[PDB]
Amino acid sequence: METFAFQAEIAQLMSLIINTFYSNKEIFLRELISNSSDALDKIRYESLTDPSKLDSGKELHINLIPNKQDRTLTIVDTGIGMTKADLINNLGTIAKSGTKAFMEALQAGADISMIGQFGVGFYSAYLVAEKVTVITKHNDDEQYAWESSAGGSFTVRTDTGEPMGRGTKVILHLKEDQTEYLEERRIKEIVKKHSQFIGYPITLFVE
Ligand SMILES: O=C1c2ccccc2C2=C(c3nc4ccncc4[nH]3)CCCN12
C-alpha cells in the first residue's frame, strides 16, 4: 500500500463537501451514474476502432449494490477503467483544475449540486460516505484499489479482490446517518428522478 498527499485545492474541496451544511445529498448518485455512463461511452467508442478492446468483457452496464450489513453502496460499471497513472497523476491534474473552477463558481453563487459541470462530481461521494474505495481495471494495466477517508491523504495498492475483467467499482462506506441510501425505495426514487435516460442498463440489486 502506497500513501499519497492530496494537493491543497482538492483537500479544501473535500473539507467543503464534508463540512458545509447542504441537505440535497442525493445528487451524489446522479454524479456517480453519469461518471459510469461516461466511462462506458469511452470503452464503447474505442471498441469501434479496435473490437479487441472488449475481449475483457462485452457487457456495458451499471449495477447499484446496497449492503446493509457492511453499510456500503457500490456503483459498478464495465466502462474503460483507470490505470495506475490515471489514479495517481492524471486525475490529480483534473482534481486541481476542476476544484479551482468549481470554487470560483461557488463564490459567484453556484450550488454544490452543479459539481459535475466541473469534472469533479466523483467527490460528491463525500456528501454521504466517510470512506470511498475505488476498485478499477483498465485493459492496459492491473486491477487497483484507490481509497480515501479524506484527512489529506489517499492510498493506492494492487487489488487482490475478485478479478473484474474491466471497469470501476465505487464503494461508498456510508456515514451512520446516511443509511437511507441502502433502501430499495430510496435508490429507485433517485434513479428515476435524475438518471432515467442513461443509455446503459442500470440494475438496482436488492437484498
Ligand atoms: O473518479 C475520479 C475523479 C474525478 C475527478 C477528479 C479526480 C478523481 C479521482 C481520483 C483522484 N483524485 C485525485 C486527487 C489528487 N491526486 C490523485 C487523485 N486521484 C482517484 C479515484 C477516482 N477519481
Could you tell me the CATH number of the domain that includes residue 13?
3.30.565.10
Question: Are the C-beta atoms of residues 94 and 9 closer than 8 Å to each other?
Answer: no
3-state secondary structure the chain: CEEEECCHHHHHHHHHHHHCCCCCCCHHHHHHHHHHHHHHHHHHHHHCCCHHHHCCCCCCCEEEEEECCCCEEEEEECCCCCCHHHHHHHHHHHHHHHHHHHHHHHHHCCCHHHHHHHCCHHHHHHHCEEEEEEEEECCCCCEEEEEECCCCEEEEEECCCCCCCCEEEEEEEECHHHHHHHCHHHHHHHHHHHCCCCCCCEEECCC
- Show binding-site residues for ATP: 35, 77, 96, 122
Residue among 122, 132, 148, 157 to mutate when testing ligand 1 (max atoms within 8 A of CB): 122
The rounded distance, in Å, linking the Cα atoms of 154 and 207 is 31
75 CA from centroid of ligand 1 (Å): 16
- Residues with C-beta less than 6 Å from any ligand 1 atom: 6, 10, 35, 87-88, 91-92, 94-95, 98, 119-120, 122, 134, 146
Cell 449540486 maps to which residue? 113
53 CA from centroid of ligand 1 (Å): 24
20 CA from centroid of ligand 1 (Å): 21
Residue among 13, 42, 90, 91 to mutate when testing ligand 1 (max atoms within 8 A of CB): 91
Q: How many residues does the chain have?
A: 207
Give the chain's domain count. 1
β 129-137/153-158 pair status: unpaired
Question: Are the C-beta atoms of residues 191 and 202 closer than 8 Å to each other?
Answer: yes
The rounded distance, in Å, linking the Cα atoms of 90 and 114 is 22
Question: Are the C-beta atoms of residues 73 and 182 closer than 8 Å to each other?
Answer: yes
CA-nearest of 91, 125, 86, 123 to 106 is: 123
Containing domain of residue 114, as a range?
Answer: 1-207
153-158, strands of its sheet edge to edge:
2-5, 153-158, 143-148, 129-137, 167-174, 72-77, 62-67, 202-204
The closest residue, in CA terms, to atom 18 on ligand 1 is 92
CB count, 10 Å around CB of 192?
Answer: 9
The rounded distance, in Å, linking the Cα atoms of 137 and 25 is 28
